[PDB]
Symmetry: C2
Subunit: 216 residues, 2 copies
Amino acid sequence: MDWVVAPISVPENGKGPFPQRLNQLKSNKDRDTKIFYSITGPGADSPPEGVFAVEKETGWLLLNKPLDREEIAKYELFGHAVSENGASVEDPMNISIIVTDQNDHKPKFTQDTFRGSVLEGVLPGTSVMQVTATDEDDAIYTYNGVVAYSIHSQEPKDPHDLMFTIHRSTGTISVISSGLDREKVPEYTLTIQATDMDGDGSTTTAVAVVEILDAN
Amino acid sequence: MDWVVAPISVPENGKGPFPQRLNQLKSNKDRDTKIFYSITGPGADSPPEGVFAVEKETGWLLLNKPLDREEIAKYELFGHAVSENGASVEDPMNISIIVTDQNDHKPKFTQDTFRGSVLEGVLPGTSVMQVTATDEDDAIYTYNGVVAYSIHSQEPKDPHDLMFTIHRSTGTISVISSGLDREKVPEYTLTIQATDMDGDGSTTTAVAVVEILD
Ligand SMILES: [Ca+2]
Ligand SMILES: [Ca+2]
Ligand SMILES: [Ca+2]
Ligand SMILES: [Ca+2]
Ligand SMILES: [Ca+2]
Ligand SMILES: [Ca+2]
């Protein structure tokens, strides 16, 4: 029995030590001859050179230094086997290295202060504005690049304390209660937060300033 | 050409979606007979049951839910190939799942306040005390569980500002300058910090109180 395709998943920023053994190659021609192994491709003999290597006799695939997914996320290499007589015995083998993500980037708001406005009359559920934070980490297979938005505080606290809400994943801010009155309170300052790992990681902070406009 | 053996490395807390394909099994007897695949072992048919599964006809190995390395770090399963009989055609295959670490734990000092003492006479380079923070994440293959120690502040700043240092990875605090005098300053309060990812991750804070003896 065997795998049809077996890619090797390697976390970025590994401790090693280096050089670090990955998986071991084997030509089933072993008994008939002595085999010598080598590799080619971007990562081996094309740039970036010498990130990966092979032990010529044992067939161990080696990683020579820690990887950075944000720099290169995938490698496609080829492994070769030649007899002691010098003849390429079999087709070269496809080697796929998948670099898996670590949470090595903090989220960042696109601005320190976002600004929006809304009419004093509006219905609860009305969009005011949208805020945005970015995270360079993977948000598809991991949560490391997935951001959770929240409102930390509101100022002032009148009439109600919880006048707005923020959509947890889109960053759209909405009005959730009535009684907006420009004459009483013309401006609210919301301290907003974006936290990666969908709310369990690092947090960064910005501000949203909401102007209340007079409906005649 | 092939791998002698090929373990599968799966990051914990994956998004999937689930069930999630890992790698695909294949018997060489595919060509001469119809094959049905299955798996056994802790993770499959022993507890924890049904974390992994196999598509009986295609041979795809499936992960049914996200993994937690801190709960189980490694699985050893066996893959089987049987004829319509139910009879093994070849030896079962060893399946190794390695669960790779995510930084899902913050570091924590063992105490909020550590206490130590040192004689007023001592030479620079003298050990005072050792402080400790733990991190449940992997500190062997990743930095996620590796802690970096630092001194944030000293009080008072007398005779001067930098009287102690902390060893970045052991948490041992040492005297780095002379002029300790109990009669002048009997006690120092150091704000200390432990940061995971060897200094690039989350930080937590505690206090070290050092008594000067006569
Ligand atoms: Ca990186
Ligand atoms: Ca990353
Ligand atoms: Ca991140
Ligand atoms: Ca975990
Ligand atoms: Ca972990
Ligand atoms: Ca950690």
